[PDB]
Amino acid sequence: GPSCVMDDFRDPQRWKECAKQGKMPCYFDLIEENVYLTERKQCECTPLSKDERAQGEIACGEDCLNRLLMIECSSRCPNGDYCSNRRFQRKQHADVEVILTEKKGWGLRAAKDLPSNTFVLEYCGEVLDHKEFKARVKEYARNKNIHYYFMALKNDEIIDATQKGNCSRFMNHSCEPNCETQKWTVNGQLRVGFFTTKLVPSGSELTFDYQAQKCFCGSANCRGYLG
Ligand SMILES: Nc1ncnc2c1ncn2[C@@H]1O[C@H](C[C@@H](N)CC[C@H](N)C(=O)O)[C@@H](O)[C@H]1O
């Protein structure tokens, strides 16, 4: 299968030409952060010393109060630049490639070994209210779309990556997945990202459990249909 790197999506003209010859997926509008279709209405970690930073100690690691609350730190974190709990904000994504699968369309694969319980990518898109979601559901069905790109975020917010999003929109479903979603608060706004739940070796497809298309995940426990 052909593959491509995330940076290949930054050049719209080369992409559209790659897409014409099947070497990249269909064009979509690449975004860095969620766009609201309709606009809506500090931890206790001790600052690491310069010595500790040099020693390789982690700032705002597993014991960070904000991290436990699933809240990212701000620029005002006691650890400032060294804070490791600003992953969404700093786009500290995993090394992933977009690949053409045998029967699912395009997907995502690990380009390096990915440790367990690490951030992969944020699921970005157009954030829809209930009314917008209703309309998009109807439109996509009218247009006979094969692939769907919806992800519930919170009450009255559903992310739609069909038209605008990032490479997260390519992560396929598996009944025995190696990633999960987590909803994180950044500056009082909720976002959602993919995180590994296992060590994913280099070359392996990244998958999550979506929640009537037959399922081609290939798992021994396959539930047979996407759900
Ligand atoms: N396990 C699977 N078995 C079959 N089709 C799948 C599976 N996982 C994802 N898909 C397909 O991919 C869509 C979900 C997309 N967000 C994933 C990217 C999509 N594969 C693409 O080529 O753009 C679904 O609506 C299905 O059409």
Ligand SMILES: [Zn+2]
């Ligand atoms: Zn902290």
Ligand SMILES: [Zn+2]
């Ligand atoms: Zn912090």
Ligand SMILES: [Zn+2]
């Ligand atoms: Zn399955």
